[PDB]
């Protein structure tokens, strides 16, 4: 007997330094009654990719898809395929899902910031994009909340310390319509307009006295300025010879012209 | 007229110091690594050799360096690089008018070196007016620049040399 | 009633570029005899880090550890703490054990490459890892390969280019007596001594036609002479201003000489 | 001993004109951003401000720039860098006993500025001498042989300096 999928078309998304076999997502293609989906078999049907990639792996009796491929300089490299799951420990029969996976960049990042350590955000990290993920869907069914990196809060010199009590969230959410990757200043505005109706809802998460602090922008756009060279002082000092040596010429002409004019006096 | 041939000859050794100080300024504008680059791609492109690269990105190669008549783009930077590269070698011969001022008139080698800055400077004027018909977003590096003050430079020089 | 350790001291070990969460290792300290150790809570009893760091977390009924803390170049900040699992989800009896971890460099990574597709490495790496270190702790029992990443061939211009049907494998072992990373020439030479006994053992794992090719050195190194720059050429054109300008002087020194001699002479 | 004066007057104006350069030699000796660096820690510093990192790291710092008079670690390297200032001071000082040529005596000027090439050239050895007691593996850059190049310069400028 086939399974049963939670959603007909599971949604994933990664990003471009991402490393081999990363954690896209888990999926769950559930026993209908028995509950004996411990003898299914997670599995793939890929479309071909250029110069023979598998790209887009699985596990078999996790159901975690990881990647086969890197991705120097690629972008918005938008992958849709099929996904199976084989009853009887892969002999019985089978229903199928399809899965779309954006591959973002550092500017499509944007770090949500909160009053809370870093691990209980990791440890309930499920529920935290459950309930960002109820609250935003009414924007697009749609979107899902794809959480890139969890560190410490990232300011100070060069934005170069860590803050233990607060945390930093790299997030974005989905196109499910013209199915690429997100830019970063949609990504604050969705969010960052009902943030107290889901500043009332971490109070079973969060703990007390805890709270979405901001959503702010991430290091690497800073140093976009910062790659970008300009007018030395070497090159400055040549075009100062230059410079000088018409400043030269200028008196030299005008005193050679009353040089000649004079010869032609006396 | 001392004092006037004092200025004469003056003016005439002024001919060999800034002579071969531009001949160095020409040859540094041959031997840079920057021509014209961007800011927004991401690269520091140089017409010659290409690092051409992307946001963020730490490994550049430039394609190109002593060239095998093919290897830029455009016949365009080709045909330019042919006219600079007659200036430079002009500016050795200019260097070798220079050498060869003990022998004839100086009234002769003043209009040898005469021509000679004259057709530097028009060759100059070329090559810095082809290389935008080359050719997007662009940030313009010191070497126009420097060149598009050395075209000034030489009409001085080109001017002072039909004075004298 | 406590668990059984597999082994009594669990040994880790991680890099300095890692993100934050990565997937150290799991661990599992099973039950004696009934086997219900799905009640098992894997937690730790941490040593103080300076700024308050908690820098190596675990999940509770995975086992699998987990990372705290960032690496703005650190390296060699070996890290020993203790680990417990206790009982009656959470509530039982428990044992206790010590995981070493430390911190390696790009500079610490030799690749290892094998005439196999990636994704069968990946699939098979923990008979591959069982293998290596079954065969390479007969130079010191207490070596474990920590598999860093697992890409396709890096190759082409330099060294960028993917072969399909071929491997990159990031390894190194564990120093257990000294207690810090292990440098990436021992790497190579402990590896590639006894090649050929374990060419002999993949073939239940690669397959057929397959083998283990060569242990070759990573991409990052050569970059090392890459971003060390040089003496440019705007630089030799002021030098060669300077040596221009005494070459000028040099003869005017000796025309001057020779100037006022034969203004005594006259 | 006409043409000896013709000599004379060129080779004044010859001491304006390498004087310039050597002006504006100087003040690119100055306003560079290499003075030592190292390739295996891996820093590009300039005992003004100092860019300093480690293996493979993109972001640097430079800790300096406009001083604050105890910025840079070594008073040696403060005292080497108030020699140099002085003889950037006296570089632009020069320009004006170029600019005071007029009015004068020539063997008055040519002394004053002999003076000032002297001092000039004794100041520069010091601070040359003083930056590797200041200070470990090392690449000096071009900036040390930039310097040690314009040692020999000024030398030669006050030596034909006392013979003017």
Known sequence: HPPVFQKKFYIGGVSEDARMFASVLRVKATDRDTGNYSAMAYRLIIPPIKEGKEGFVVETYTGLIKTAMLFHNMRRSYFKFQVIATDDYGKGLSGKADVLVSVVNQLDMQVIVSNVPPTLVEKKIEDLTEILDRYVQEQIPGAKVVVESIGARRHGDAYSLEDYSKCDLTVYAIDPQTNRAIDRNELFKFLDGKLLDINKDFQPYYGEGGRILEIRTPEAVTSIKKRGESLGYTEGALLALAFIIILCCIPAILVVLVSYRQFKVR | ?164
Chains 1, 3 share one sequence.
Not at chain 2, 109 to 132: R, S
């Open chain 2, 1 to 164: 007229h001392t004092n006037y041939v004092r200025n004469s000859r003056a003016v005439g050794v002024m001919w060999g110091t800034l002579t071969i100080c531009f001949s160095v300024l020409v040859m540094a504008l041959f031997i840079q690594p920057y021509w014209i680059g961007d800011s927004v791609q991401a690269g520091y492109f140089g017409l010659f050799s290409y690092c051409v690269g992307n946001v963020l990105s730490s490994e550049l190669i430039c394609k190109g360096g002593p060239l095998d008549f093919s290897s830029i783009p455009s016949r365009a930077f080709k045909t330019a690089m042919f006219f600079v590269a007659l200036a430079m070698f002009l500016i050795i011969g200019s260097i070798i008018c220079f050498s060869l001022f003990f022998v004839c008139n100086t009234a002769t080698v003043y209009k040898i070196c005469a021509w000679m800055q004259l057709a530097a400077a028009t060759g100059l004027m070329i090559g810095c007016l082809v290389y935008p018909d080359g050719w997007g977003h662009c940030t313009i590096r010191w070497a126009f620049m420097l060149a598009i003050l050395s075209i000034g430079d030489a009409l001085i020089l080109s001017f002072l040399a039909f004075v004298l």
